């Protein structure tokens, strides 16, 4: 019947729209992940460099 086909079409369209929105949300999650990774690299570099260039002299004196 017309009601059945209309309902099935609406359900399919609703699922498609939800999928599209979920895709954009996953994109935002991936962007946050990338920002976190780049700052992980930077902070590891800074931490090691500082801990080797500011606690090296204490061994030189002691």
């Amino acid at each position: 019947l017309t009601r059945a086909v209309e309902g099935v079409q609406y359900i399919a369209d609703h699922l498609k729209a939800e999928d599209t929105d979920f895709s954009v949300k996953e994109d935002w999650k991936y962007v946050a992940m990338v920002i976190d990774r780049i700052f992980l690299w930077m902070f590891i570099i800074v931490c090691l460099l500082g801990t080797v260039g500011l606690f090296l002299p204490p061994w030189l004196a002691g």
């Binding site: 019947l1 009601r3 059945a4 209309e6 309902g7 099935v8 609406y10 359900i11 609703h14």
Partner: protein, 38 residues
């Protein structure tokens, strides 16, 4: 016969249920947006 009407009724109920869920989600998102604005 009766099966066709029963199935049409079930499909109509499913569609109405999904419409109601969509409206509820929309209003919840409106409340979230108000919180962000404040």
């Amino acid at each position: 016969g009766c099966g066709l009407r029963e199935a049409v009724d079930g499909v109509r109920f499913i569609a109405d249920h999904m419409r109601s869920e969509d409206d509820d989600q929309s209003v919840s998102e409106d409340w979230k947006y108000v919180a962000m604005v404040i």
